[PDB]
Symmetry: C3
Subunit: 333 residues, 3 copies
């Protein structure tokens, strides 16, 4: 395979490494490295801890971006400082359980997998060692996404280009933290110690936490998403294990691929869309109003009470044609 090689410097979510939308490049071998990290992390503002397992130290794993017909060559590294075997399954790839059957590595090993990007869209990647370890590694945080863009960039299905000014990747994580007898979340010394209680809870199908970017409030305050009025923002949303229903409070999905695959035309003008567990989808919105937006899953219990709220802070001029407070709050006459 005698194609040009291109290295990518991955960046932590919700940001996305620099890339072209439309490109004049032909196929390349695009090189990525992912280093697995098992680590205890804090997942809420109460200080609850969690035995996480991650690609590149983040939940979600970073977004990888290539174009249709590229070859994606991933060096997956499992340092000796980890305790368990791991692998990678790319839903964008064809064969060998998405790559999982070719990438199982013990602590102290690395492996190099290449796959041809024959399907466009956004796709989940995740660890999948075998058997009951599959769900456990995924809900412990071992999932991310890859975006395979058409070489001509995105289109509306009507002949028009859809160019985004910026893209964010929102990875949603269902987490299963057990409680003790008096009702407090438990803490564990190792993922292995957490396994028995965690699996018992997993099988009951109700998460304790549903978070974006690994933690309650991760995408708020200093780390709010941003935009300006007039900017077209692409929001990639993934969920490797469980359904979600994204919604931009005060906005819309102007163009939405809820099944996430660019061979299909987008839907237009959505209020709320649906990410099937085990998939990524994408929504584009051109901001029209400044101020705070919340980006949620629209199970509002999940959003407000279990962790699944991000914010956008948007700069620009208020549009009184689109909305106005005709009369401020006043005593009823």
């Amino acid at each position: 395979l005698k194609l040009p090689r291109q290295k990518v410097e991955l960046v932590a979510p919700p940001f996305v490494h620099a890339h072209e939308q439309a490109t004049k490049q032909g196929p390349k071998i695009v090189e990525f490295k992912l280093t697995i990290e098992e680590k205890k992390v804090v997942i809420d503002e109460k200080g609850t801890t969690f035995q996480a397992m991650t690609f590149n130290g983040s939940m979600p794993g970073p977004l990888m971006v290539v174009h249709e017909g590229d070859y994606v060559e991933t060096t997956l590294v499992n340092p000796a400082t980890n305790t368990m075997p791991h692998n990678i399954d790319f839903h964008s790839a064809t064969g060998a359980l998405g790559g999982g059957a070719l990438t199982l590595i013990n602590p102290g090993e690395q492996v190099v997998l290449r796959w041809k990007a024959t399907k466009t869209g956004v796709f989940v990647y995740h660890c999948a060692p075998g058997g009951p370890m599959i769900p456990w590694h995924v809900v412990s945080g071992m999932n991310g996404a890859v975006m395979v863009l058409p070489r001509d960039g995105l289109n509306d299905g009507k002949g028009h280009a859809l160019k985004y000014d910026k893209v964010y990747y929102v990875g949603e994580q269902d987490m299963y933290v057990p409680r003790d007898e008096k009702g407090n979340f438990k803490s564990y010394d190792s993922p292995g110690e957490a396994f028995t209680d965690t699996e018992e809870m997993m099988k009951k199908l109700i998460p304790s936490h549903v978070v974006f970017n690994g933690k309650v409030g991760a995408l708020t305050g200093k780390n709010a998403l941003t935009a300006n009025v007039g900017e077209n923002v692409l929001i990639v949303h993934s969920q490797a294990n469980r359904d979600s229903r994204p919604h931009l409070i005060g906005g819309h999905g102007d163009y939405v691929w809820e099944t996430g695959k660019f061979g299909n035309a987008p839907e237009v003008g959505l209020e709320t869309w649906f990410i099937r567990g085990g998939s990524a989808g994408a929504a584009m919105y051109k901001f029209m109003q400044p101020g705070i937006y919340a980006y949620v899953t629209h199970n509002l219990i999940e959003a407000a009470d279990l962790g699944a709220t991000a914010h956008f802070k948007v700069e620009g001029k208020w549009n009184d044609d689109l909305m106005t407070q005709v009369k401020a709050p006043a005593e009823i006459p």
Copy 2:
């Protein structure tokens, strides 16, 4: 803004205020009033009670109908007889958290919000005061829907008009009523008294009841939906917090916008469709057979055991070509 004003007299669900589909009117300011009512109601045939919070006294709130490019001017009233602050978020609107950031009113106040109907479809509206109150007010009943019709009426995406003979609005409500130690549903003196137990249950994500129009059996008996053979009926379905999968038992969705947005062509000939939590969708069906139909969510446990069944009673002539009982029940030979 010097456009003509038009008042609407809202009507309680499942009925819909009179409106045009295709219209020769240009944009107007369409005036609506919603008066919040907190009230204890009965939600099942056992007499279980529920601390409801409502727009205009109903669950769901009434369906508002306008056309693309209208301005929707809502007077939201929170009488002093209520206990809590409330607001309104229109998923059809652009800016200020759907209007929620411009409509927070204490008991004794009213506010007037106007928004431009730039997106077509059916959309959820709901209360959203802030924080954990968001889910609580919504699952207490504070949600309804708005329909923004194209000025040319509905179409099939193939150049043909789709005209409905009547429309019904089915609002589905997930309810969380706690149980005491011996397993009976609890009753509370106020919404505030219900809050702690109700939130604890909410976070476990399993409703005690799933109802249409506020109560088990609301859309049955005297209050069954009706049609005649040959009539095209539009069924708007909303769910502000939780997924649903509508199905007309003995019928179909001839034309379905399950994401609910009229810029997209309908799907055809569905058995069951999917309303994402936080959205409204719509289905049209031309009745072909008389008799009783059930309209359900097709989690049949929810439908038959938790409350989520409506009936249609349909008049007309039986069509033996479409279905016939060739041989009535008889002893096996």
Copy 3:
């Protein structure tokens, strides 16, 4: 009704009785027989038992295949060896609650129902006796599917024929097996004895098991699905009561009707699709790589821990262009 009659010999899932895709036949009366069987079965590799109720002895019931405009004439038989009344509701049919209102039969009876296949697609059929028996009979196993093909066969919505080399029917079943005090699954002497505990669990909406073809591991080992590289396989998936999110691990859905209705064009290039509870959908894939695939619902907890995994064993030549292990596992440098 003076049309030619054609008998079908049904075959147990996941296989499908022989049929034409495109056909030069005109409408016929296609005759099917379904004999209900109530039976205690084993559903997992631990030996857990289950009070099943079935059409033709299988979970799911067998796939029936006809063409648009055929008349489907079903003899439904409820032998005296059963204990309960049963009926059948075809989501493909128009009128009388899908046929349920014309097919209620006591043990010792049979009934003959005919319906005209006016809607194309894959559709659920299920028992629906009335009231709380509806969900109970369905989650006890009394559901299957029917496929109504266009007379010209399937198409891509772009003028091209889509011909499958083989079809499999995967019926997914949510099961509710109660546990005793010490946490073991309970066994019952009759469906009636199982009812009280089973309904109590049903209403909590969390299954104990989620299986394909009636049992954990049913579609693995000797009974793995099969294909060859180059074969186009249609996978019909149904779920009569509860959502699912199918995914072919190492493959894709090349053409997917997730709402299952052939009047709509398929989506292309999906990773994971969505079967709404109360529906059947279908996905076509042309295999490109040999080896083992898993076909799952992509709630991976359900897939790996509750029973919902099938395998494909695929023969043919490995394609190193599409995927290659560039470097086998090795010590990190």
